[PDB]
């Protein structure tokens, strides 16, 4: 927790294993959850160039020995000495040291030898939705436009059966004419074909002068296209759904980016609201005749995999094009039916954007997520960087392999990278098209150390992270965070106290999600509970062949509950949800802070008791909390469902609350409203707030995630006698829940029994 | 019963030698150099508390009229006159917070005594367990 | 200890015993014999 | 299990957790996911069980309620209970086509004065949201559209409604509210059908006594019996017995003319004369009493009660 | 294998009956008594100092005595709770030879049953 407060990094093992055999013994992958941008109260922005080691590229860090008599510092990684250049020869005395040597996380504003490009935003706006859906899309776009920064530059493109690329901010000679370059659908023009036809083939050329311009110079031209935004006029053939080329629309947007701004801040914002019907990205036919793909369809490798694979090839081609150019892409998919997240996820995970997943635009999840995307920080600027390159500087002992999360490997193959790639690797640095204040990347490491006598005396095992992002003030930036973990001194056990239960739990979530992308769900589940059972067998106190002597430390005891809920959650089970819902889950899981992703693994069950008169207490997620006299608050990052009982609900009906003896009932009813809106306005994509009550409202969500209390298994345990006719015929009206899930109590029983015999 | 125990009871020799003796040494040192840290931080505060009772002690009662201030004092008589019970409620209060500060550093440095026999002792449960249990697994082979 | 070992062995025996159930069927198979004998009496007519 | 020493489960075995039924858990919830597969595919499951011993009808009732299938429980495959039931399963109408419908889409609309709570019987909701859904749920709610892959001439579905009006001054006098049903089913001839049925009803005056002539005790008894046997699935049957007792006390005291603390002045109207006798036979019927029955036999009565019409429910 | 078990007995009980844990404890006891003696020196040097610093220093009496004795009697609560705390980690450090040599007798007896089995 304090480790996340300082640098934003969270290792699974705070103390590391010694050797390769020690890495096999600890049995879990060493890894961390560095949040790159991560506004904490420890960064200091300074307008001088960083001092760089010629051998390693290391920036002077607080764990550097400074030879004051020779004006030389030593690099802690390469063990080579470097001098202090000129200005740092004086004022290097022991009382006056710079902020490089005092604070671990330091920020360098990169003095250039010019107004750097402010962020760009395309608005790939859909038209083939229902009228009230489109009207509120106009309203949200007007409010988003009012939340543009003054220097920010925008370009509208409204698509449908064919893309209309509207040019902005024309001459004052007309004022009464808007132009739109129309590209017909069902025709996959290449990248260079779009450049030549548009004719675009101090950072704005006259070819793009009809195109992208400041919002401070357009104004009326933006408000015009948003208010003559209307439907498509095509009579569809009988039962056909309105024809839509989403894949063409993204290619036209990305091709404008190519001849225009190459390595400059830009983000395409898709507002898709229906699946692609024709042209590229084909997921279902133009007519509403044959079924769209399902989770069942991917299970039994149906014929609709021809629309899964060949549409994946197109969207990964556009994903790689967006990566090599340097611009991120956003999805605001808000369709009532299936739209195609599992193809369009490869473009948002590689570049890094938003995967907001509304249903119909009036719902709360869309509206505030758009305005939270363009909100400002305490300094008033936009709280998101661009063109971030994150390179690691490992030490001699350990070597990096993977960066599972919102980034993409580039290269620079060398001695810092080892074999056995988990995730995406063969690289030291990771490109990221844009990175906000929520992105978290899982960096995996492995300790080689073939001989146990290679660690330096009291080795702190240095590791330096370097991110080169661009801030929307117009200033290129470089932030370095330098961290150390002492490890594996010969008094045995040290690696295990450094283990913390939540950090490694999210790490195995991201590894399970990447391995479901490659192979099927059965073998990754067999690998996952093998990782659990081999951990529990070594990392517990027991005697062999005696399960009654089982014991777990405070670090080691809550991890099986995250593993039970992880095997219970929708990331590994592709059933019970549509493929777009599962892809929505996996897309935000790879980019999530550890505290918020832990909530998404095991949902919170903040309980609101009447008789307690005080703060909430976290109860166990089970159905021994559905008593009718309480209120419930489930928090699973996607639903903030507030569950009433039948006793509280009928108090609301006949009105105990209105008559003034029940002021405590008013506080019991306003606490769910006020504390939930606190939850909604802090976290990204703002979850669907839904009122609930017992046996009604929309409580089918909460009764789904909540474990059954009176398991039918405990309703078959031996010993029926002498209670058949007693006691005035009534007890409390219990609720019964049926699900495939064995109880948390019995899942620990197989965990203990299998670990003890092994 | 020479049944190839030689290579595997030898690694039980190695595990029992570099861990059973060395852990006992390395924690017997652990408390004695934090209780010699008790010696060093006790005596630093002996230094500043002795000097607070030599110049403040002598300055009162070496210079005429201020030594008359500790001649009248709070007077050695009854009838506390509603000024010298005003006063010494803060005298035992300053005695209270001085011993509160002393017990609270006592508590914090006794955490370093106690937060050392959980982890390393469980290691001695640990690395001798899979050696002994496997000494019944491979023993049931011939 | 043998008292409490086979007070359970006897108690398991009566719940696995259906002594009151196998008399109500011995009456119904006897009246099935009487019914099939009555059917052969009507068959000769 | 296989070994014959262990016996099958019973009502006393279910109420107080015996080890004779260690495998009924993943039994019952296996048949729930087969019924889950059945409704997305639009296939029905009918069960013709015939044995002296129990066939497990308590756990496999869940398909026949979920898709609209029928249950025929007999003691042998040769008694007249089996031969005639299987034979009328294939009986034809006046055109020679089967007297059943498949893949039915029962869809309900309402005026803005009232919504739908839920449905009880051989149907399952689809989650079709809308403005006509009520907060309260009775059974399968959260939709205006239910799947029923099997219906016939006797399949009757409970629909529960709730009035959402807050004040009586918002209604003009003599206001008529309307409701509507559509049934989109395959006919056996191989063609899409759509049966639209519309009813009109009038709201009462603000006085609470004016609804008394409009009461129908015979259909309301089927309503309370069906809601009782649904609530016994999750709650205790004993607690349901207290519920129907106290609802009978409130209904009788509200709709009868009597002097206070004078039992000799009691009188009930014609519309409420036989209704208290209905819950006398309801609390002694096998639907809520588990005595002298098998759980399979109780599952047989509860499955056929959820799909019968008003006259058959009065007979049982 | 019997030669390895026999010198396992010798290498183990040399730890058990070594009066070597004893002497390092006699080292920590002699610095315990003088350190509690120097606790009394902190007591005397501070008790006299807090008296002297109130000799010199210079609402009504029925408010400043209402406070500062409510700042007393929380001293009553904190040396009550912290000393009750103090004996608790005294007792968890009062496990030093209690279970560490219970480990060593567990190894001694478990390897004794293997030794008698090999001798049989």
For residues A671 and A679, the answer to whether their CB atoms sit within 8 Å is no
Chain B CB contacts of E52 below 8 Å:
53, 56-57, 60
Q: How many CB atoms lie within 10 A of CB D99?
A: 15
- Cα(B13)–Cα(A608) distance, integer angstroms: 59
Q: Report the C-alpha gap between E10 and E19 in whole angstroms.
A: 16
Interface test with D, best of A696, A699, A702, A717 (most D CBs within 10 A): A696
Q: Give the gap in angstroms from C-alpha B114 to the nearest C-alpha of chain A.
A: 15
- Asked if A723 lies within 8 A of D239 by C-beta distance, the reply is no
D248: Cα within 13 Å, side-chain hemisphere: 21
Q: State both tokens at A355.
A: 């995967």
From the candidates D1, D3, D5, which should be mutated to test the interface with C, based on the most C CB atoms within 10 A?
D5
Of D181, D149, D122, whose CA–CA distance to D305 is shortest? D122
Of A375, A360, A427, the C-alpha closest to A399 is: A427
CA distance D75 to chain C (A): 14
Strand partners, A352: none
**C-beta separation of A565 from A601 below 8 A:** yes
Q: Which chains touch B (3 or more CB pairs under 8 A)?
A: A, E
Q: Which candidate, D215, D108, D203, D212, places its Cα nearest to that of D165?
A: D203
Nearest Cα residue to A163 out of A135, A207, A134, A125: A125
The counts of H helices and E strands in chain A are 20, 29
Q: Which of residues 52-91 of B touch E (CB under 8 A)?
A: 52-53, 56-57, 60, 69-70, 73, 82, 85-91
- The rounded radius of gyration (Å) of the Cα atoms in chain E is 28
Contacts of A487 (CB under 8 A, 6+ apart): A15, A16, A17, A18, A455, A459, A461, A494, A495, A498
Backbone gaps in chain D, preceding residues (C–N over 2.5 A): none
Mutate to test the interface with D, among C11, C13, C16, C17 (most CBs of D within 10 A): C16
The answer to whether A244 touches A159, Cβ cutoff 8 Å, is yes
Q: Which of D36, E66, E68 is nearest to A575 (CA)?
A: D36
Is E61–B45 a contact, with Cβ atoms under 8 angstroms apart? no
Q: D17 at the A interface (CB within 8 A)?
A: yes
Q: How far is D6 from chain C (nearest CA, A)?
A: 7
D228 near D240, Cβ under 8 Å?
yes
Cα distance between residue D252 and residue D247, in whole Å: 9
Task: Give residues with Cβ within 8 angstroms of B29, minimum separation 6.
Answer: none
Q: Read out DSSP for B26-73?
A: HHHHHHHHHHHHHHHHHHHHHHHHHHTTTHHHHHHSSSHHHHHHHHHT
On the 0-12 / 13-18 / 19+ scale of CB atoms within 10 A, D131 is: exposed
* E118 contact residues in B (CB cutoff 8 A): 1
Question: Taking CB atoms and an 8 Å cutoff, what residues of chain A touch B138?
Answer: none
- Containing H/E element for A37? none
How far apart (Å, rounded) are the C-alpha atoms in residues A446 and A399?
6
Q: Which of D225, D233, D216 is nearest to D284 (CA)?
A: D225
* Chains B & E: contacts with CB separation below 8 Å: 148
* Tokens 């409390």 sit on residue: A732
Find, among D219, D33, D192, D184, the residue nearest to D106 by Cα. Answer: D184
Contact D185, D102 (CB under 8 A): yes
Other Cβ atoms less than 10 A from the Cβ of A196: the count is 12
C15 to chain D, any CB pair closer than 8 A? The answer is: yes
| CA distance to A580, D211, D215, D255, D273, per residue, from D270 (Å) | 58, 13, 10, 11, 5
Query: Which of A492, A497, A538 shows the shortest C-beta gap to B19?
Result: A492
Residues 6+ apart with CB under 8 A from A726: none
Distance CA D9, CA A149 (A): 71
- The answer to whether residue D14 neighbours chain A at the CB level (below 8 Å) is yes
CA-to-CA distance for A360 and A273, rounded, in angstroms?
A: 8
Closest approach of chain B CAs to the CA of E34, in angstroms? 9
Cα distance between residue A383 and residue A377, in whole Å: 6
Do the bridges between strand A162-166 and strand A180-184 make them parallel or antiparallel, or are there none, so unpaired?
Answer: antiparallel
Distance CA A160, CA A146 (A): 25
B123 interfacial to chain E (CB closer than 8 Å) = no
Non-local (6+) Cβ contacts of D123 within 8 A are D68, D106, D140, D146, D147, D148, D157
> Is the distance from CB of D183 to CB of D133 less than 8 angstroms?
no
Cβ contact B85–E65 (<8 Å): yes
d(CA E24, CA B26): 12
**Which of C13, C14, C15, C35 to mutate to test binding with chain D, by most D CBs within 10 Å of its CB?**
C15
What is the C-alpha to C-alpha distance for residues E39 and B109, in angstroms, rounded to an integer? 14
Does D contact E via 3+ CB–CB distances below 8 Å? no
> Are D16 and A735 inside 8 Å of each other by CB?
no
Q: In what order do the strands lie in the sheet with A631-635?
A: A617-618, A604-608, A631-635, A642-643, A691-692
CA distance A736 to chain D (A): 5
DSSP class of A52 = B
Cα-atom radius of gyration of chain A, to the nearest Å? 29
Report the neighbours of A using a cutoff of 3 or more CB pairs below 8 angstroms: B, D
Alpha carbon distance D220, D91 (integer Å)? 31
**Considering only CB atoms, which chain A residues are within 8 Å of B127?**
492
- Cα separation, A686 vs D231, in Å, equals 36
Q: Is A269 helix (H, G, I), strand (E, B) or coil?
A: strand
Helices (H), A239-305: 246-259, 295-299
Contacts of A75 (CB under 8 A, 6+ apart): A53, A55, A56, A58, A64, A81, A82
Taking CA atoms, A237 is separated from A231, A234, A285, A286, in Å, by: 17, 9, 12, 9
E42, B38: Cβ pair inside 8 Å?
no
Q: Measured at the alpha carbon of residue D145, what is the angle toward residues D142 and D151, in degrees to the nearest 5?
A: 125
Give the closest of B35, B93, B117 to E28, CB-based: B35
Kindly state whether B50 is in contact with chain E, defined as any CB-CB distance less than 8 angstroms: yes
D238: helix, strand or coil: helix
Q: Identify whether the C-beta of residue D133 lies closer than 8 Å to the C-beta of residue D108.
A: no
Is the distance from CB of D159 to CB of D139 less than 8 angstroms? no
- Distance between CA atoms of residues A591 and A585, nearest Å: 10
**Region for residue A612 given its phi and psi (left: phi exceeds 0; alpha: psi -120 to 50; beta: otherwise):** alpha
Strands A642-643 and A691-692: parallel
Continuous segment of H or E residues that includes residue A398 = strand A398-404
Cα radius of gyration rounded to whole Å, chain D: 22
Strand partners, A642: A633, A691
Quick one: which of A640, A642, A638, A705 has its CA closest to A679? A640
SS3 of residue A118 by DSSP:
coil
Give phi and psi for D269, each to the nearest 5: -75, 175
Distance CA A516, CA A512 (A): 6
Interface test with E, best of B46, B71, B73, B93 (most E CBs within 10 A): B93
Q: Give dist(CA A31, CA A422) in Å, integer.
A: 11
Beta strand D47-50 with D71-74: parallel, antiparallel or unpaired? parallel
Number of CB atoms found within 10 A of residue A730's CB: 16
Which among A517, A651, A642, A527 is positioned nearest to A587, based on CA atoms?
A517
Tell me the residue length of chain B: 142
Q: Which of the residues A24, A26, A27, A493 would you substitute to probe the B interface, choosing the one with the greatest number of B C-beta atoms within 10 Å? A: A493
Backbone angles phi, psi at E106, to 5 degrees: -65, -45
Which chain E residue is nearest to residue B13, measuring alpha carbons?
Answer: E8
Per DSSP, the three-state class of A133 is helix
Residues A100 and A107: their CA atoms lie apart, in Å, by 9
Residue among A126, A354, A159 nearest A252 (CA): A159
The residue of chain C nearest to residue D3, with distances taken between CA atoms, is C16
Looking at the complex, report in whole angstroms how far the Cα of residue B19 sits from the nearest Cα belonging to chain A: 7
Chain D residues lying within 8 Å of A695, measured CB to CB: 136-137
Tell me whether D19 touches chain A (CB under 8 Å). yes
- CA angle, corner A622, sides to A620 and A627, nearest 5? 100
Which tokens is B127 given? 């690395």
Tokens of A48: 């001088």
Identify which of A59, A81, A56 has the alpha carbon closest to the alpha carbon of residue A70: A81
Residue given tokens 């001849």 in the structure block: A259
Name the token pair of B78: 């009854």
A594-601 and A579-589 helices, crossing angle to 10°: 150
Q: Is any Cβ of chain D less than 8 angstroms from the Cβ of C8?
A: no
Q: How far apart are CA A253 and CA A269, in angstroms?
A: 10
Residue A732 has which token pair?
């409390």
Asked if A716 lies within 8 A of D16 by C-beta distance, the reply is: no
| Residues of chain B contacting A496 with CB distance shorter than 8 Å | 119
Which of E4, E63, E84, E97 is the best substitution to test chain B (most B C-beta atoms within 10 A)?
Answer: E4
Instruction: Confirm or reject contact between A731 and chain D (CB < 8 A).
Output: yes
The 10 Å CB-count burial string (b at 16+, else e) for D170-192 is eeeeeeebebeebbebbeeeeee
Q: List, as one string, the DSSP characters of A308-333.
A: HHHHHHHHHHHHHHHHHHT-EEEEE-
Q: Do B103 and E95 lie within an 8 Å CB cutoff?
A: no
Q: Could you tell me if E46 lies within 8 Å of chain B, comparing CB atoms?
A: yes
Contacting residues of B for A492, CB less than 8 Å apart: 19, 23, 120, 123, 126-127
Cross-chain Cβ contact A491/B129 below 8 Å: no
At D38, phi and psi to the nearest 5?
-75, -30
Which chain D residue lies closest to A691 (C-alpha atoms)? D135
Which DSSP category does D19 fall into?
A: G
Distance CA D266, CA B6 (A): 100
Cβ-contact E48, B56 below 8 angstroms = no
Contact D182, D105 (CB under 8 A): yes
Is A541's CB within 8 Å of B125's CB? yes
Q: What is the DSSP string of A198-233?
A: HT------GGGTSS-EEHHHHTHHHHHHHHS-----
């Amino acid at each position: 927790h304090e480790h996340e407060a300082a640098t934003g990094c969270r290792f699974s093992w705070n103390v590391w294993p010694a050797t390769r055999a020690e890495a096999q013994k600890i049995e879990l992958p060493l890894g961390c959850m560095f949040t790159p941008l991560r506004d904490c109260t420890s960064l200091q922005l300074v307008e001088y160039e960083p001092v760089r080691c010629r051998v390693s590229g290391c920036i002077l860090n607080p764990f550097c020995a400074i030879d004051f008599r020779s004006k030389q510092w030593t690099c802690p990684f390469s063990l080579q000495r470097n001098a202090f250049p000129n200005h740092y020869a004086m004022h290097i005395s022991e009382q006056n040291l710079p902020a490089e040597l005092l604070y671990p996380t330091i920020e360098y504003i990169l003095p250039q030898p010019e107004s750097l490009p402010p962020p760009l935003f395309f608005l790939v706006v859909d038209t083939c939705v229902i009228e009230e859906e489109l009207d509120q899309l106009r309203d949200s776009l007007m409010q988003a436009l009012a939340l543009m920064p003054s220097d920010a530059m925008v370009g509208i493109i409204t698509y449908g059966a064919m893309a209309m690329l509207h040019e902005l901010g024309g001459g004052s000679e007309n004022v009464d004419v808007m132009k739109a370059h129309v590209f017909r659908g069902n025709k996959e023009l290449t990248s260079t074909q779009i450049q030549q036809q548009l004719g675009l083939a101090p950072l704005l050329r006259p070819a793009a002068a009809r195109f992208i311009q400041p919002v401070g110079e357009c104004e009326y031209k933006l408000t015009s296209i948003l208010e003559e935004l209307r439907r498509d006029s095509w009579p569809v053939p009988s039962d056909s759904r309105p024809m839509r080329c989403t894949g063409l629309a993204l290619s036209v947007a990305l091709a404008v980016l190519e001849a225009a701004w190459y390595q400059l801040p830009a983000r395409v914002l898709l507002f898709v609201g229906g699946a692609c019907t024709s042209g590229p990205g084909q997921v279902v036919d133009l007519s509403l005749c044959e079924s769209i793909r399902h989770h069942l369809d991917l299970q039994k490798d149906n014929n609709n995999a021809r629309f899964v694979k060949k549409a994946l090839k197109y969207y990964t081609q556009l994903a790689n094009q967006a990566v090599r150019s340097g611009h991120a892409v956003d999805i605001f998919a808000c369709s009532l039916d299936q739209v195609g997240l599992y193809e369009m996820k490869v473009m948002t995970e590689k570049t890094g954007g938003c995967v907001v997943m509304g249903d119909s635009f009036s719902i709360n999840v869309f509206k505030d997520s758009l305005r939270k995307f363009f909100e400002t920080d305490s300094t008033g600027f936009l709280k998101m960087g661009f063109n971030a390159k994150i390179e690691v500087l490992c030490s001699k002992e350990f070597k990096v392999c993977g960066a599972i999360g919102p980034c993409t490997g580039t290269g620079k193959k060398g001695c810092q990278v080892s074999d056995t790639i988990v995730g995406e690797g063969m690289t030291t640095e990771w490109q990221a098209a844009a990175l906000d204040k929520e992105s978290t990347v899982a960096f995996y490491f492995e300790v080689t150390n073939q001989q146990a006598q290679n660690l330096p005396p009291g080795k702190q095992s240095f590791l330096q992270f370097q991110t080169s992002y661009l801030h929307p003030s117009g200033r290129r930036r470089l932030r370095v965070t330098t961290l150390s973990y002492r490890f594996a001194e010969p008094n045995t056990i040290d690696v295990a106290p450094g283990f913390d239960q939540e950090a490694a739990a999210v790490l195995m979530t991201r590894l399970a999600v990447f391995k479901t992308e490659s192979e099927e769900s059965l073998d990754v589940l067999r690998w996952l509970d093998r990782k659990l059972i081999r951990l529990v067998a070594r990392f517990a106190d027991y005697q062999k062949d005696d399960p009654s002597s089982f014991h777990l430390s405070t670090e080691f005891s809550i991890y099986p509950q995250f593993m039970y809920h992880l095997r219970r959650s929708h990331f590994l089970q592709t059933f019970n949800a549509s493929p777009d819902e599962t892809a929505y889950y996996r897309s935000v899981l790879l980019r999530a802070s550890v505290m918020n992703a832990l909530v998404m693994i095991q949902p919170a069950l903040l309980e609101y008791s009447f008789e307690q008169q005080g703060p909430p207490q976290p109860v166990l997620l089970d159905a021994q909390a559905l008593k009718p006299n309480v209120i419930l608050l489930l928090d699973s990052f996607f639903h903030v469902v507030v569950w009433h009982g039948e006793l509280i609900h009928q108090w609301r009906e006949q009105g105990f609350h209105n008559m003034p003896e029940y002021e405590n009932l008013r506080q019991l009813l306003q606490a769910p409203l006020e504390d939930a809106k606190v939850i909604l306005d802090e976290r990204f994509p703002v979850p669907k707030y839904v009122q609930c009550n017992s046996g009604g409202s929309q409580a089918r969500f909460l009764l789904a995630k909540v474990n059954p209390s009176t398991n039918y298994a405990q309703t078959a345990g031996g010993g029926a006698a002498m209670a058949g006719l007693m006691g005035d015929s009534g007890a409390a009206g219990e609720s019964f829940i049926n699900t495939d899930d064995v109880s948390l109590k019995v899942f620990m029983d197989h965990l203990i029994k299998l670990a003890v015999q092994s | 019963e020479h049944c190839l125990c030689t290579e595997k009871l030898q690694e039980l020799m190695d595990s029992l030698d570099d861990n059973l003796k060395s852990y006992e040494r390395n924690v017997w040192q652990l408390q004695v150099n934090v209780l010699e840290d008790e010696r060093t931080e006790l005596q630093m505060k002996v230094a500043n508390l002795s000097e607070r009772l030599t110049e403040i002690q002598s300055k009162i009662m070496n210079d005429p009229f201020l030594s008359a201030k500790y001649a009248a004092a709070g007077t050695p008589g009854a009838v506390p006159n509603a000024q010298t019970q005003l006063r010494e409620a803060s005298a035992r209060l300053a005695l209270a917070e001085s011993v509160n500060a002393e017990l609270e550093r006592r508590l914090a440095f006794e955490r370093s005594i106690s937060r050392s026999w959980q982890t390393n002792l469980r290691a001695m449960q640990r690395e001798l367990r899979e050696h002994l249990a496997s000494l019944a697994l491979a023993s049931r082979k011939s | 200890k043998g008292i409490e070992d086979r007070d359970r062995l006897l108690s398991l025996a009566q719940r696995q015993d259906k002594s009151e159930e196998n008399e109500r069927l011995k009456s119904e198979v006897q009246q099935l014999k009487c019914r099939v004998e009555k059917l052969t009496r009507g068959a000769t007519v």
